[PDB]
């Protein structure tokens, strides 16, 4: 007997995740099976994506030594059956208003900022870099949330100071880079490049920094196949390239530039995408997804 999700109060929704109040000091952090591509949440869910990404997050939490917001096991009796395997019980924290980002490679808004200004989030970079260039050391490239449906706004370190305090900002920078460095080296050892990552921190009652997000999922982090890493061109998304290629190919009937909501995916593409998630999970964790809890 587990409670119903309807026993808990919904407090937040993201594109592909949900948050619920369990009591005054705990929340329920729920991954869904929805997937986003080209800034659209697609009509077609990916089977088991919520469970797979939750397993991934749990693995990486176990790998990292930093305090985190997990407040119970993946089978905690407070978790409803309906979300079992894709929801975790977490401690309620005072969240810090910073999207902490580390970039090991230059792509996306990071590359664009560099191409426009020669710098990213206050970091003046060497000349001659381009798409998927390795950054060494990794860059702290923080961002702030914007309006609904808008991309996060890249900001520099001074902006983070103004948001959370000088000493805390230094802590966010150091911890974000330490955590990314550890995770990325682990993943690369297993054949996957984590090109970048984003996560949020909160502060507990004693004032300590606590990692409080999904961590190193293909949604929070660019997953790349290391065996095909080729600086100078756009790398395939380990998990979403089948989806991307179909949507923008000759069979979808959809024009990406038209900004109209994309059509549903072929079942075959959704199944193939689930397999990519399982492959990435099992390679990185060294575990079997068949052992991960579910309904
Ligand atoms: N441990 C915490 N304590 C207090 N607040 C949060 C919190 C609030 N918002 N978010 C972002 C978010 C995470 C998942 C699903 C969403 F819809 C939104 C996280 C957390 Cl993780």
Curated annotation (Swiss-Prot):
Q: Per the record's keyword annotation, is RNA-binding included, yes or no?
A: no
Uppermost EC category: ligase
Q: Give any single GO term for biological process.
A: 'de novo' IMP biosynthetic process
Q: Which GO terms describe its molecular function?
A: ATP binding; phosphoribosylaminoimidazolesuccinocarboxamide synthase activity
Looking up InterPro entries in the UniProt record yields: SAICAR_synt/ADE2_N, SAICAR_synth, SAICAR_synthetase_CS
Please report a single Pfam family linked to this protein.
SAICAR_synt
Gene3D superfamilies found in the cross-reference section: ATP-grasp fold, B domain (3.30.470.20), Phosphorylase Kinase, domain 1 (3.30.200.20)
Reactions the enzyme catalyzes: 5-amino-1-(5-phospho-D-ribosyl)imidazole-4-carboxylate + L-aspartate + ATP = (2S)-2-[5-amino-1-(5-phospho-beta-D-ribosyl)imidazole-4-carboxamido]succinate + ADP + phosphate + 2 H(+)
UniProt keyword annotations, A-Z: ATP-binding, Ligase, Nucleotide-binding, Purine biosynthesis
Known pathway: Purine metabolism; IMP biosynthesis via de novo pathway; 5-amino-1-(5-phospho-D-ribosyl)imidazole-4-carboxamide from 5-amino-1-(5-phospho-D-ribosyl)imidazole-4-carboxylate: step 1/2
Its EC number(s)? 6.3.2.6
Instruction: Say which domain of life the source belongs to.
Output: Bacteria
Q: Which is one Gene Ontology cellular component term of this protein?
A: cytoplasm
Family classification: Belongs to the SAICAR synthetase family.
Query: What NCBIfam families does this protein map onto?
Result: PRK13961.1 (NF010568), purC (TIGR00081)
The protein's name in its UniProt record: Phosphoribosylaminoimidazole-succinocarboxamide synthase
